[PDB]
Amino acid sequence: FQPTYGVGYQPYRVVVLSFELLHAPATVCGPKKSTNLVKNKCVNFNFNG
Amino acid sequence: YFKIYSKHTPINLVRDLPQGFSALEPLVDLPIGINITRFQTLLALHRS
Numbered sequence: 001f002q003p004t005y006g007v008g009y010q011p012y013r014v015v016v017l018s019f020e021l022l023h024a025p026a027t028v029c030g031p032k033k034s035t036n037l038v039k040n041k042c043v044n045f046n047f048n049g
Numbered sequence: 050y051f052k053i054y055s056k057h058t059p060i061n062l063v064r065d066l067p068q069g070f071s072a073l074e075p076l077v078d079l080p081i082g083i084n085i086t087r088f089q090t091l092l093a094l095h096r097s
């Protein structure tokens with residue numbers, strides 16, 4: 001690798017993420033977004049499922 | 050799911066289990082996903 005190389009010969013760092021689902025409980029979850037809490041109104045609540 | 054429930058109790062009985070009631074709180078749930086059919090306690094030696 002040299003810095004004066006062409007774009008087809010320049011070094012590229014590659015990270016491959018492999019996602020598998022197995023019968024074990026899935027623990028790598030995404031960051032579920034949280035809506036601000038509203039009180040004293042008839043709302044549809046979803047608390048931890 | 051591996052459920053570990055635990056309770057710490059202050060007792061002063063010498064030999065056997067004391068007679069009483071103490072409900073065990075849930076401490077930790079472990080995502081293990083493995084087959085378990087046998088177990089073994091781990092102790093600690095005292096060296097001098």
Ligand SMILES: *[C@@H]1O[C@H](CO)[C@@H](O)[C@H](O)[C@H]1NC(C)=O
Nearest residue numbers: 023082083084085086087088
């Ligand atoms: C778990 O292990 C026991 C003893 O080795 C075996 O009889 C049983 O079939 C196993 N279960 C699974 C789902 O592999």
